[PDB]
């Protein structure tokens, strides 16, 4: 990566809005973290709950559907870490809710395994499929922690 893209990715991760605004161009808004998993700025902003940065990147042409090296999209990151507002922003901008990574994990697998009831609910309202099996043969329901009976009920 050029130094500028590196700084952009770090700023997206840190939620440094002003630096994002300075460095975000048509050429860099969908740049990829080559030294790592080829995450985009939107992958970082989504995973680290940087809401202002997520909104800015989306407005400026960031690809909600962009897959990293593992086939994860920013929605996977938001759901894994319980960032409800970010998840809603991505979904409202057309994010595919049944998107599957290289291991066939979906956002619902993430939200279910991580005990995020409201995100599970959001995903289901948008057509997320609780019967989708990952590479291990596990559905999102299969991944729910024993104590999370509310999420079990929701997904069943």
């Amino acid at each position: 990566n050029s130094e500028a893209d590196r700084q952009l990715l770090e700023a997206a991760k840190a939620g440094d809005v002003e630096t994002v605004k300075k460095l975000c161009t048509v050429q860099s808004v969908n740049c990829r973290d080559i030294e790592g998993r080829q995450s985009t700025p939107l992958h970082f902003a989504a995973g680290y709950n940087r809401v202002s940065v997520v909104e800015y990147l989306l407005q400026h042409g960031a690809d909600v559907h962009a897959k990293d090296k593992g086939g994860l999209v920013p929605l996977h990151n938001a759901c894994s870490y319980g960032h409800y507002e970010v998840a809603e922003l991505l979904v409202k901008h057309g994010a595919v809710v049944n998107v599957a990574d290289l291991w066939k994990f979906t956002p619902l697998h993430e939200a279910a395994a991580k005990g995020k009831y409201e995100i599970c609910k959001l995903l289901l309202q948008h057509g997320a499929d609780p019967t989708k099996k990952n590479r291990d043969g596990n559905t999102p329901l299969d991944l729910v922690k024993d104590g999370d009976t509310d999420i079990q009920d929701l997904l069943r």
Binding site: A46, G47, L72, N77
Partner: peptide
Amino acid sequence: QRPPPIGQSFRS
């Protein structure tokens, strides 16, 4: 083997 996604739950 699937690594954890980029990100974290708590800002703190």
